């Protein structure tokens, strides 16, 4: 039936890795994997250091014992520290016994991941996000959420892809991979920064239309087809990402399952962009959803 | 900022309780708490028994050894079985060492909970749901999801409120509390059953409008107020639940935080119902959201 939900990965393998990192009066979250704790390097900042911190200079004045690391109620001993890009790596004398099989991945714009929102090292909530084309995410983060991570789970392996650092003025979020490199052009200082144009992830909207068809929501199917070049003219007007032949190939499984050629679905999407949804819903949404990948759709449609 | 997401509870405390229950050729999920496994009683049904099962008669032919219970790759020994309403309770010789502090609660229509969707005893995904006024939920469930549970977490205590049993023809879902009593008038047989009218949870839409204001999405605030009786005339036309003085009292914290009297917000809601959203969004939604309780809003707005 028409039941289709934004589903997050079960969070238990990540919950066991969240710790609290305190330096002076600043507390945020860290990720404890093996004998290393990862956290945003601005744990070392006071509120008169945020406008333009010199992180190398601020770190000169910090020693192992200035980093307080707490896993639940239990204190970790810090035996080494280093800065890698915008993350701090705290070497502790105890390997996390709850460390899962894991990898660090730098995800591509358009890919989705689960966020485990944490405050003071304690898990608060889990939700699904996408890396947007402008390298922001539409999260739900407050003061104290920094160091919360984004991940995907493939069988038993956790692929960590995001660490939370900041909120931009449109209310969207920016952060790093687990090597401390920002997604997008953002820097970890409190200066005027703005997200570029928020373009729609075309291949995901198409995947979600396939999901609607598989789930029996079929009203938007029309009698038309189109070409990649003509569809892509329409993509540009409505700030959709161009569709490529790689995107068409990636939609192959969904196309094969439904028997609907990708260019036929593109012609259905073209009409939805030009005419709107006339106050109808698709899988219970009144807007075109772009935060389900082709892989997410196949997963939620086939178990 | 305007970031507000359907957030689920972290699932780790529930993941450790999911097992697989097999009886003959039927496999579904069970919940392993202390030395008891809970699962839907139709684990004992074959596909020629679903139209009108006599569960008491079907259970006569079942012994402890006919219930296969697997936690991961590890077989549990069944030393007793009983039927309680629409659930089976399998006594096993091993207390689940991962059993969390927990309670069984029968939730009220309008209350929200997290679902951990499971297939073959393995967690697949987590998402937030509401018990709708017609005692259905708008889930994402396939074949094999039966026995998946709904829960809330308050600190360290897990309150189990839902076990999944069935899908109705509108694509919505029905199930039981953990004592095996259905929410609503549904029965565990494959017969013509239909959800009643799907009314909107008025107090939740109001809570979500307070969230929009707290998050700076303010365009829908107007210069008007109304009365409970006049608002409630409008509630009826649009299939909204009547608003009561208890609902007004429950919205007290959000009213106090924003300084917006509940009847002023009701007058804003009245105009949104009568005039629609004119293709605008509130917290990124093109429809009025009713699956955030006042408590959910306060939680996501205050950490
Ligand atoms: C995060 O939790 C952190 N909080 C602190 C802190 F209190 C002291 C020292 C270091 C850190 S990191 C927090 C999460 C934000 C808060 C609101 N919603 C969030 O997601 N991150 C920040 O406060 C972050 C840190 C400085 C300023 N930050 C911002 O997010 C600001 N944004 C920007 O300046 C902009 F993005 F450029 F617009 C802010 C506070 C939202 C205006 C730094 C970037 C180091
Ligand atoms: C659930 O996973 C179960 N599957 C089996 C099974 F394969 C064999 C024996 C027992 C069970 S319980 C499954 C979940 C459903 C499937 C589709 N989406 C879901 O959420 N539940 C059922 O198949 C359920 C069991 C019989 C028929 N069921 C229904 O959900 C049917 N619905 C109804 O008859 C209606 F609700 F009344 F409309 C169905 C299959 C969707 C048409 C019973 C109620 C015992």
Numbering used by the authors:
A (entry chain A), B (entry chain A): 0 to 302
Give sentences from the paper:
Here, we identify two orally available 4-fluoro-benzothiazole-containing small molecules, TKB245 and TKB248, which specifically inhibit the enzymatic activity of main protease (Mpro) of SARS-CoV-2 and significantly more potently block the infectivity and replication of various SARS-CoV-2 strains than nirmatrelvir, molnupiravir, and ensitrelvir in cell-based assays employing various target cells. X-ray crystallographic analysis shows that both compounds bind to Mpro’s active-site cavity, forming a covalent bond with the catalytic amino acid Cys-145 with the 4-fluorine of the benzothiazole moiety pointed to solvent. Using the X-ray structures, we also examined the binding mode of TKB245 and TKB248 complexed with Mpro. Both compounds have been built on dimethyl-bicyclo[3.1.0]-proline moiety in the center, γ-lactam as the P1 moiety, and 4-fluorobenzothiazole as the P1’ moiety. Taken together, the structural data strongly suggest that the 4-fluorobenzothiazole moiety plays a crucial role in the potent activity of TKB245 and TKB248 against SARS-CoV-2 strains.
